Amino acid sequence: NVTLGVPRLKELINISKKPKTPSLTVFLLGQSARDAERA
Amino acid sequence: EITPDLWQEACWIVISSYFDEKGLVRQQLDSFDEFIQ
Amino acid sequence: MIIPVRCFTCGKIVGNKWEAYLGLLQAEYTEGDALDALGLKRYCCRRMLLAHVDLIEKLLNYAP
Amino acid sequence: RTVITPDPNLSIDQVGVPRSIA
Amino acid sequence: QARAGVSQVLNRLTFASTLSHLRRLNSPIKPRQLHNTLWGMVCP
Amino acid sequence: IVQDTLTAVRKFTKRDVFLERGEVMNLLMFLSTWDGKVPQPAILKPRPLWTGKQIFSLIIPGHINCIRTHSTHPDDEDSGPYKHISPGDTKVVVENGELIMGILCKKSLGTSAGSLVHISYLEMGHDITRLFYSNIQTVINNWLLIEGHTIGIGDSIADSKTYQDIQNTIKKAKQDVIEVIEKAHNNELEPTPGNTLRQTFENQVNRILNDARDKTGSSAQKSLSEYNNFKSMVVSGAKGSKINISQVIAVVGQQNVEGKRIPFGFKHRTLPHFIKDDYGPESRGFVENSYLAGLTPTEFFFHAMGGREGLIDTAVKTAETGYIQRRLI
Amino acid sequence: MIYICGECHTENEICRECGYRIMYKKRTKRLVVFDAR
Amino acid sequence: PYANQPTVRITELTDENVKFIIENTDLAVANSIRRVFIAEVPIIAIDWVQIDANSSVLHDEFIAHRLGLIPLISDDIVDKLQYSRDCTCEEFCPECSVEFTLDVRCNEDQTRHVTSRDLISNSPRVIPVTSRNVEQDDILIVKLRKGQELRLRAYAKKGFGKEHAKWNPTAGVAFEYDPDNALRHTVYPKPEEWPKSEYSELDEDESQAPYDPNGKPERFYYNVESCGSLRPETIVLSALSGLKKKLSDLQTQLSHEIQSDV
Amino acid sequence: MLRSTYCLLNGLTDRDLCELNECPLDPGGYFIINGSEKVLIAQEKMATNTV
Amino acid sequence: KPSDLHLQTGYKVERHMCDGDIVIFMGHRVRILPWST
Amino acid sequence: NAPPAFESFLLFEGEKKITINKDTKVPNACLFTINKEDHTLGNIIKSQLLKDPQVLFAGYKVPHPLEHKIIIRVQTTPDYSPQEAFTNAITDLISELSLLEERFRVAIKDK
Amino acid sequence: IYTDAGRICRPLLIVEKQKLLLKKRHIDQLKEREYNNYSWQDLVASGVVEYIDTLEEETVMLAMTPDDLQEKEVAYCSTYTHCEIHPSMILGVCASIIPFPDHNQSPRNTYQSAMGKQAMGVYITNFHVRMDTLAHVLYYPQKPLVTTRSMEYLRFRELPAGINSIVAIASYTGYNQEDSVIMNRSAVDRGFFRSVFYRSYKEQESKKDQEEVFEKPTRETCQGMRHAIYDKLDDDGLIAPGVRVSGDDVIIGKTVTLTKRDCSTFLRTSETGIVDQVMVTLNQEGYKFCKIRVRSVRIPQIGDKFASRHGQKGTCGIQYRQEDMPFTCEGITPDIIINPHAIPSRMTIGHLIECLQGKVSANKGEIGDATPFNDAVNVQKISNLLSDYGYHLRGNEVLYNGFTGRKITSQIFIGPTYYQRLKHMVDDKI
Ligand SMILES: [Zn+2]
Ligand SMILES: [Zn+2]
Ligand SMILES: [Zn+2]
């Protein structure tokens, strides 16, 4: 549940040190990328 | 003894009796009347 | 306040059909026939009697 | 200071100021 | 130090205003959404 | 461009509309850029009738080129045959400043990408485009005294072919919510990974109340007639939000507060008319009825709650974006 | 300078006959022209 | 290149209603006679109101409105008067005004109704309507209780309806043309639910006449109902002379614009 | 408070009330303070004596 | 004071308004349409 | 402030009724300006100027419907003047209104 | 157990194991309320109704209607303890005045319930005696043709708030841009929405020692004042009623005695009305006082703001004539034209049913029924009662043109609808 709209847009105007919803999208490299059992 | 489909004019009788007796601003004529009593 | 002369919409005089309308509701006449006996066929004129409030009665109580 | 009212018979860069204000 | 806003001044416009100026609550400051226990008590 | 103009441009610019001989002499009188010379009409076996696309070619200021697609144009209409003909008379083609075909709409007269008002700011300047507004702000604003464009209540009633079928969806919607309550009240529903059995119950049932909200939403728009005056303010695109007249006719839909269907206020009972353990398709907010048919006195309270959560945010989002913009300056 | 009372309706210059202290101003004598528009 | 030659057929001429049919004219001339009736027919109404003693519960500019809208009997002296701005005197002479008078008080006990039969004229021809001698009960103005008095003078100008609308001589002029829809000036979406009108020559089965590929209308069905000031027939005679006079206020004035360029 | 058992109005019938220039439809529930009309709004609080 | 109705070039006269003049919100242009809006 | 009502049909001292100007776009055409009139007088003369076959553009408009000032535009063919159309189009209408009034008075005397 | 001061509670009917305790022998005695005095204080005592607070409702079982929720169907629930009187009593004072409030998108029932306060009307029937500031009063108020059965209890027949108007929903010459309304000036001439606006003025004479007294200032014995001519002032410094005051002329000539300073009280806003009444009393202390009520009419110009009972507040664009307003087949020219586009996004279909119901109820001759959940007035039998008089049963009607006399290619939807003139006037600021 990424917060979009005004409570996110308000937060980059002051660059809050503590995000109310931070996240980290992470991709993959090898043959693990094409299997759910390897990943 | 029981009203099957005459209910519509029935329920607007028992309300007519209500706003006759209590009316609309008795909530300050009970409350302020009980404060001086 | 009181019945207006001349229904605003079409122009027709309706301002004398009031004391002949309160007196005409003493009898058994329905409102749907109390106006056609007065000769009012448009629904411009009929809203000026059927939905009228004559408030001049309640003001004729107070002292001048 | 008064109301604005719509009026489609003015070429867009126009306003109708009434004679009690102008 | 007081709770102001009590004893407003009364409307005279419509007589439906004069009524619904008298049947009135006042929250003291979620007090804004519409709660389920206002069936029958307060106008939604 | 106001609504009154931008709708009526659709009705001015079909194939159907023909102006006899006297009405040209008025819709030429209300131009400004016109050069005094009357065009030669199309039809000539009766009175020489002028099509509304010929006169609308006289507003378009000089040589301007554009191609757009009206908002009804099926994508399958671009096959081999019927490519440049397009028998709904969509597919705006303005070659050489003279309107060859196509109905206009908002999509090709607003200010969007590739727009015919956009192109006439990148070729002809700005004082040639201000005349392109104050011509269309008159000659369709003053043609409409021959068309009118009313909205009776006959323009907001479903015919009984679909109105009975629009209930044949919702009578199955409230069936397939009973199907998932009694399935999950027997420990017979596998929890989808990511959420518990509670949050995956709600996502399972909000699935079966936004498909029936939309299977009663596409069959209502298509069933409206060609003369229906709501369709003239949706197809013409001047007034968007085609979900806000799908609640007139068919189904209001779901209510929500905080993004969830109505929470239990009293004690596991959202109103004092219900039993406990009511996760059903009506005791948490969904509305079978539409505004034409009226609303049940329970469901009038629930729409009073969905209209309160969105009535506040407006009072909040004026102290939010009225503050970013006066700070970011 | 002649005041109609609000109780006894008895005019005076300046109440007597009523003991009452709300007066009025006794509508003027000049000639005011309307229109019947 | 020349004019059109109409006809007139009348079906009803009662004491307050004229209903007829004009053939062989275009529509634009056929608006321009129903547009003169409710606008440009002169008539007498009250226009100068002075109250010398008011004590009713209605404020002074609320009875002065109602004295405006009372219709007056203007059969004879409309041609035999002139307007106020074409006058000779200072403010009001008897050639252009009609003075009324009202002096009613109510010292009786019972509630008195000040009616139309208490406006006393100075000239015996323009009496207010509801005084012509159907019972036709009296026009009302203002009720009064015990202890109240009304007193006022009034004048009564000649004017017409592009002034205030009290000078409307008529009620609703019910113009109507082409009752079968054979010209297709309107397009019925469902032709079957419509009321067949008061003048349509159809049976019950069909509901629209077919199209006329070379036609333009005649038979403009006027239904001129008068309010009660004029007679219902002396409107139309005094309106075609109030339009033949106006079109003869052009080729006079147009000539002294063209020929003065020499 | 105007019209509640201690006012001079309560005790008067309908005709007797218009001999003082009053209104039979005036609801009452407002006390005059230095001329003008005031209404004590209901100030909502939280219930006492519970857990 | 018609002694002081002189007008030679260089002076500054403050008229009321006309048509065609430019006023501010963007910049409109005054056309005169007599009512109160 | 609100204008008085009698300014919708009167010519004050300083106005002419008609001012005539030419068409600088297309030759053998002309233009009028009736002062203090409305669609009652405008639509009859527009319509009768269409029965004349030596007239190619009979139109009129009112610029703003607030004040009353009709603009009329006439385009005639060669061998004819457009100040002769707009004078003959009136004098056919006065032959018309003289023809109803002699005919409608008769249809009262049959009642 | 709560013997507690300040809760809130409401009366419901009582169910006894299957059915009511409101029996036919009760309500036949209620019906003759005169000369039997069986008025709700013997119906509580006989144990038929019962006050229920907000937190026993957490323990209770209600039914909406005694009709459908006592007849056994597939047995939803069978343990009903109570029933409610009629489920449209949950709406407050100003939200009961809306006809069909289950047909409105709920932003518009909230919107009207805030505009009901502002719409002027005859407020209290003793404004001849009062000396308020801000007293608006219509000339000819009308009780509505389409009404609720609880207007009667809200007292809205003896004191109404607006005039009906034949209203058409059409696009036209274009002065109705999405919140605007084309009036009819030859209906405004017959008093349509024409209303008075009173005014008042406090004037405490106060002796203090600079003291001041009511008097008439001669120009060359008193200090600073404008060119407000002192003709209207009487022998003592008050205006007698019936003297038309213009913009900015002296109404009370008060002078702080000093030669003397000058403290006139001007007519603000330059309205040019009529001074209607002047009273002269003492204050609380023993100082002479005066109140003044300067009245003015206010004809509805271009600008003055109108609104129905169905949201959608509007202005007044242009005032056409009976001459120009589009006439029906029978000489009806509607008082007000509202824009079509204000319907489908403001979303009030209450406005297209009140406009339908007033066309039935001005030919059926019976003031209509628009209780909220009445279940007996749907738009099918409003239609087929309209079809028994010779109209088209969706309310449509052929207008003609205003200027040309051409039949319009489409129809127009006409019908009388109750409009309110608000207090957001255009002459409150000019
Ligand atoms: Zn009428
Ligand atoms: Zn006294
Ligand atoms: Zn004279």
Side-chain angles (χ1 to χ4, degrees), chain A residues 15-35:
Chain A
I15 300 123
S16 101
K17 179 156 166 98
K18 286 176 75 331
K20 288 186 180 182
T21 303
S23 68
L24 171 56
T25 175
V26 173
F27 295 91
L28 297 181
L29 284 175
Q31 290 179 353
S32 66
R34 295 187 301 274
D35 292 327

Side-chain angles (χ1 to χ4, degrees), chain C residues 7-12 42-46 48:
Chain C
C7 131
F8 339 131
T9 303
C10 53
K12 184 186 291 186
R42 272 78 163 271
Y43 59 85
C44 168
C45 308
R46 291 169 62 91
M48 212 66 62

Side-chain angles (χ1 to χ4, degrees), chain G residues 5-10 15-20 23:
Chain G
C5 173
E7 175 66 25
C8 66
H9 291 270
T10 60
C15 182
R16 69 264 184 98
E17 183 64 28
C18 57
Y20 194 68
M23 294 295 105

Side-chain angles (χ1 to χ4, degrees), chain C residues 31-53:
Chain C
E31 289 175 349
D33 201 5
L35 281 87
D36 297 343
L38 292 168
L40 296 176
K41 187 257 290 182
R42 272 78 163 271
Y43 59 85
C44 168
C45 308
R46 291 169 62 91
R47 71 181 169 89
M48 212 66 62
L49 280 170
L50 187 68
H52 173 68
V53 166

Side-chain angles (χ1 to χ4, degrees), chain A residues 6-7 9-14, chain F residues 317 319-321 323-324 327-328:
Chain A
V6 179
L9 182 62
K10 185 68 176 291
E11 197 161 3
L12 307 181
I13 276 13
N14 295 339
Chain F
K317 203 182 263 79
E320 291 286 325
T321 64
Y323 177 72
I324 291 297
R327 181 170 73 186
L328 203 150

